[PDB]
Amino acid sequence: KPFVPKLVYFEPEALSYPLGKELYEKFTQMGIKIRETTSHNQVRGIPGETELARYRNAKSTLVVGVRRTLKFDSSKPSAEYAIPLATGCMGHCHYCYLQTTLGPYIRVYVNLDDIFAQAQKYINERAPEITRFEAAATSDIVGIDHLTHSLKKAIEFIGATDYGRLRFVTKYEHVDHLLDARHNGKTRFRFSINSRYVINHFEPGTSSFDGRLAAARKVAGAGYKLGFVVAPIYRHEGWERGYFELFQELARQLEGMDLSDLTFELIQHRFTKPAKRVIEQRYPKTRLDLDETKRKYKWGRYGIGKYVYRDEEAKELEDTMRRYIEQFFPGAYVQYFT
């Protein structure tokens, strides 16, 4: 059930680090097909004759490498920065924004000393103000972590700092190895949730809603700060009742738990102009409605723009989500709607 790659690439430089050495001996012991990248770290020869084939096989391929870009991206509204522990995902969410943000093997970085050292510099440059880090900005870091334990190390590193905070969101239940981690109350452990329609139709290759909630109870019992990310908020047929049933069912599955300091994050479905065509050839018979005529185009600033719902329909979603959260989780804090 936990993700295990069917193909692994190693950057030569990765073998100079403890994690690279450990992963090399791990995957060779497991008899998994292991390859070397070029001297300039390019991944060549991923199986597949069509574009869709190489996309599928890429999502079953792991690349063990070194993070050379030590400048951290900003990650608002979640956190000040994105801490780069991994890139890519094993899941096949039809709407996924990684389809345009990438183009899709799973990359993991081994130079944790360097990455954490850089994280500490960002913390020092803003202290005594709090600096939050998003570890799942460009990947499902939790779904990958049983292989590496990099997130666990990041959790404990952040736990040792005074002004640092960590956060990440996942669609996977494979969190057992993280339960005895010394988080020190400085990690927000979030789970992506959605209506039954969106999960059943658009989220294959992820854990079930029940699995995610089972995992959510485990992490909360281990003392982690708990939160949920309701995204993508998607106006499907019967969305108002669909999302009502979500929060009702969510409240039922978290019965008899300390839900003080529970957070919610709300993201409406969004897609870029290229995504329409890219998704059409990566998921041909998807029910995902990418009709531009029912959307508002929000023009980009430094990046490319994207379609979102019109201001009025967006407010319907926001007001509705806020109403259900207040009904089923009194005192819970909605961090943002975007």
Q: How many residues bind ligand EEM (CB under 6 A)?
A: 18
Among 7, 231, 254, 279, binds ligand EEM (CB under 6 A): 231
- Taking the alpha carbons at both ends of the chain, their separation in whole angstroms is 33
The answer to whether residue 269 forms part of the interface with ligand EEM (CB under 6 A) is yes
Contact 253, 289 (CB under 8 A): no
CB of 58 closer than 8 Å to CB of 102: no
Stretch that binds ligand EEM, among 16-24, 69-77, 166-174, 250-258 (CB under 6 A): 166-174
CA gap 306, 326 in Å, rounded? 30
CB of residue 35 to ligand SF4, shortest distance in Å: 23
Q: In terms of CB distance, is 20 or 138 closer to ligand 0TT?
A: 138
Residue 136 binds to ligand EEM (criterion: CB under 6 A): yes
- Partner whose binding site includes residue 5, from ligand 0TT, ligand EEM, ligand SF4, none (CB under 5 to 8 Å by kind): none
When the beta carbons of 283 and 328 are compared against ligand SF4, the nearer one is 283
What residue 78 binds from ligand SF4, ligand 0TT, ligand EEM, none (CB within 5 to 8 A, per partner kind)? Answer: ligand 0TT
Using rule CB under 6 A, residue 192 touches ligand EEM: yes
Judged by beta carbon, residue 37 or residue 268, the one nearer ligand 0TT is 268
The backbone torsions φ and ψ at residue 140, rounded to the nearest 5 degrees and listed phi first, read: -95, 85
271 contact choice in ligand 0TT, ligand SF4, ligand EEM, none (CB below 5 to 8 Å, kind-dependent): ligand EEM
Distance CA 245, CA 131 (A): 35
- 96 touches ligand EEM (CB under 6 A): yes
266: tokens are 């709300």
Closer of 61 and 75 to ligand 0TT (Cβ): 75
> For residues 14 and 259, what is the distance between their CA atoms, to the nearest angstrom?
42
Ligand-binding site membership of 96 (annotated): yes
Cβ(116)–Cβ(156) under 8 Å? no
Instruction: Tokens 């990765």: give the residue.
Output: 14
Beta-carbon contacts of 144 under 8 Å, excluding residues fewer than 6 positions away, are: 3, 86, 90, 106, 108
Q: What sign results for the dihedral spanned by CA atoms 84, 90, 91, 95?
A: positive
In this complex, which beta carbon is closest to ligand SF4, that of residue 34 or of residue 98?
98
Place of tokens 């991923």: 46
| CB of 52 closer than 8 Å to CB of 281 | yes
89 annotated among ligand-binding-site residues: yes
Contacting positions for ligand EEM (CB under 6 A) = 89, 95-98, 136, 140, 169-171, 192, 229, 231-232, 267, 269-271
Known binding positions for [4Fe-4S] cluster: 89, 93, 96
